[PDB]
Design a protein around this ligand. Sequence first.
Ligand code: YUT
Ligand code: ANP
Ligand code: MG
Ligand code: MG
Ligand code: MG
Ligand code: MG
Ligand code: MG
Length: 318
Amino acid sequence: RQIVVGICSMAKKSKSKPMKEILERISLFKYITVVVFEEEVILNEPVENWPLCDCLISFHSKGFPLDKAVAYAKLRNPFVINDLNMQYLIQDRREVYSILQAEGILLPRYAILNRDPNNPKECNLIEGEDHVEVNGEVFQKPFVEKPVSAEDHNVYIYYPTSAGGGSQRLFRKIGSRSSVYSPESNVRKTGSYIYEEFMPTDGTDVKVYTVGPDYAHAEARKSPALDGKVERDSEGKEVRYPVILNAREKLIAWKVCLAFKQTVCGFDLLRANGQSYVCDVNGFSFVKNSMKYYDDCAKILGNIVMRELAPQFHIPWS
Ligand SMILES: O=P(O)(O)O[C@H]1[C@@H](OP(=O)(O)O)[C@H](OP(=O)(O)O)[C@@H](OP(=O)(O)C(F)(F)P(=O)(O)O)[C@H](OP(=O)(O)O)[C@H]1OP(=O)(O)O
Ligand SMILES: Nc1ncnc2c1ncn2[C@@H]1O[C@H](COP(=O)(O)OP(=O)(O)NP(=O)(O)O)[C@@H](O)[C@H]1O
Ligand SMILES: [Mg+2]
Ligand SMILES: [Mg+2]
Ligand SMILES: [Mg+2]
Ligand SMILES: [Mg+2]
Ligand SMILES: [Mg+2]
């Protein structure tokens, strides 16, 4: 028989152009059959009725029932490319940062402000006009305020008085805009946040995309922290700039991939002060609109599957 690679995600991801491009290429492997789980099945059918697979590629995004995916993996015991239990942790920036620190990965100096919602004024925050103190730790402006939920993209940057004060409010992009200036200079007073030092870059973010620990594609985009105007090409796509990772950065990618147990893993680097700092780990993400990436990513994933499962199946492989 064929080795079955099962794809288990929300339809917005399963049916995305990058996913379809990569699955068509994985299907070219002679002994691999791809099965994409229907969203109606994922949401509405018990996991005992989900299709069988030998290798499971499954990842959380908004609205995905991760509990069911975990239960499926437990029931069927496939080879899992992206660890499902770790995807609970990736949803919490506190957990992400904890893992990065444990791996000796450079990240912005940060502090966690946990607020009890039934008692929002009893947390360890002191605010001045040009700084905050969080659990005693001082962050001079500029500083960054991130919701503890990694799925909440309402990240705020607070500007110093010397720069005219106010804040930059980021959000999941809406057409031409990724952020907007606000005259508000005071921090949010409900919710839990990470406060972190603002890392001075050249105005670009480096977005890194792993396919296993020994392959990483990187590209740069304009930082939303800049003015918030999205640069789009003639085709409506956000403008990307070329990046080659240095030796330190390839090691970061190796570490992130393995630490989060996410074969396919997106994360963000800030090139600042002669170093590279990780500020976000997103988990499963494909590069968009690169044919070379689609070719490479499919080859690596197919090869991983064959290396793992060819012997069980009595299939020749090197
Ligand atoms: O799951 P991913 O494929 O990683 O997609 C994540 C990002 O990708 P990346 O984080 O930049 O690599 C998408 O932005 P790009 O397509 O990269 O611009 C997002 O694409 P969008 O910003 O919609 C778009 F396609 F770029 P536009 O329609 O503005 O051209 C995608 O956001 P949506 O939710 O709105 O689809 C996001 O997913 P999520 O919001 O679930 O985090
Ligand atoms: N400490 C920091 N110093 C400077 N810029 C920062 C810092 N943290 C975040 N940023 C900027 O703010 C952007 C958004 O922060 P990030 O932590 O990636 O948020 P997110 O909501 O997880 N976005 P996404 O990549 O879509 O999941 C980054 O891409 C940087 O441009
Ligand atoms: Mg095939
Ligand atoms: Mg995601
Ligand atoms: Mg969108
Ligand atoms: Mg990010
Ligand atoms: Mg993120």
